[PDB]
Design a protein around this ligand. Sequence first.
Ligand SMILES: C=Cc1c(/C=c2\[nH]/c(=C\C3=NC(=O)C(CCC(=O)O)=C3C)c(C=C)c2C)[nH]c(/C=C2\NC(=O)C(CCC(=O)O)=C2C)c1C
Ligand SMILES: C=Cc1c(/C=c2\[nH]/c(=C\C3=NC(=O)C(CCC(=O)O)=C3C)c(C=C)c2C)[nH]c(/C=C2\NC(=O)C(CCC(=O)O)=C2C)c1C
Lengths: 189, 189
Amino acid sequence: GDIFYPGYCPDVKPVNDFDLSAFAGAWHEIAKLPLENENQGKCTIAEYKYDGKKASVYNSFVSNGVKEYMEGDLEIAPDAKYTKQGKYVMTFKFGQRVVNLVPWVLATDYKNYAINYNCDYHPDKKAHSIHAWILSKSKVLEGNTKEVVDNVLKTFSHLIDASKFISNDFSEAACQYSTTYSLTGPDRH
Amino acid sequence: GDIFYPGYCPDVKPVNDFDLSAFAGAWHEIAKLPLENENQGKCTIAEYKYDGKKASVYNSFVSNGVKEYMEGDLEIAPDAKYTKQGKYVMTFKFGQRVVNLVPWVLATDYKNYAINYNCDYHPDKKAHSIHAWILSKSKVLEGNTKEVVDNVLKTFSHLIDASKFISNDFSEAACQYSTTYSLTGPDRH
Ligand SMILES: C=Cc1c(/C=c2\[nH]/c(=C\C3=NC(=O)C(CCC(=O)O)=C3C)c(C=C)c2C)[nH]c(/C=C2\NC(=O)C(CCC(=O)O)=C2C)c1C
Ligand SMILES: C=Cc1c(/C=c2\[nH]/c(=C\C3=NC(=O)C(CCC(=O)O)=C3C)c(C=C)c2C)[nH]c(/C=C2\NC(=O)C(CCC(=O)O)=C2C)c1C
């Protein structure tokens, strides 16, 4: 199950001076906090492409030999347009269902790692769930960068319980797929 | 039991431009979050006296006809001296045991109400307990002021669960006492 904690989401401020073009690229999910929709995928990678005017997203993972993917639009969050903070929206369409995902970027050096997060409040439960992802431009978080990440993460110890991260897998095996499948699309729901 | 929530205490900033002389006086505890040491006392009042150089505290409550009290020193918290925020220390001595209590003042209008709080982190439990007190210069929080308090409290909804407050009692009966007893003192532990 996803991780929930009592009460409203805590105050949090994402990264300043966010640079979307610098952020663009293929991000590997080295690890994440449990997230129902993606708990079973492996070799999880999110690829963001930028035009200067337009941004798009290509997300994929592999489940039992199948490569599932999603294609959508990406844009800076309306409020972040004014503050210049790292907050973006990913819009995906499943038939008539439209989804607007909003990851918050707590920190990143743009070339090697990113620490993303979200807080989802359930009023009916008076509790919130927390989601987080350790992202890297390499399939492995390597030694220098590993230390960098760990120290940064530490400054967010009151927002993310590091001990709850779950490592993803990028072995050739894990990433292997015999076939594909688009989760997004007009003939979806 | 006291109220605990998981993780480290959240970020919080107490009232700005704190004025100790204006704060001085007798504060009635209209309500509080459960706090073991004082759960049984009634007619609970904290009285702070200021010289301009020196501040002292006189705390009291009544348990079964007995008026228990504590006498100590009061001073602005070392860090608050620089920031001018509302944070103070109460030092009490029980024999050789010395206690340094630190309430944080979230908000106050000085003449009628104050909203005090604290967060105690237990590393061995990876959780923190939260304490809070609604204080008033009158034995009753009256109508205008009640509305004022409620609206202020609302801005702290992510830090204090209002529904957990417990009302104190200031009836003549409650405050009645046949005898006294000093909890503080040299012949204490
Ligand atoms: C790794 C970077 C990454 C990521 C990756 C990701 N998710 C994926 C999968 C999915 N995302 C989804 O949203 C759904 C469900 C789609 C549906 O509604 O049917 C799936 C299966 C895939 C590959 C397919 C990939 C690469 N997904 C996010 C962000 C998110 N993924 C989320 O589900 C949410 C909302 C969380 C919440 O409910 O509160 C956010 C912010 C980030 C930051
Ligand atoms: C109402 C204002 C008020 C108050 C009142 C108060 N407490 C009292 C009682 C006590 N306070 C104490 O600390 C102890 C235990 C003393 C001991 O260590 O033996 C007792 C019995 C009395 C009357 C006696 C009164 C008026 N006490 C506080 C503040 C506090 N009371 C606390 O116990 C703590 C630490 C909480 C924690 O453990 O994390 C704080 C900040 C405020 C802001």
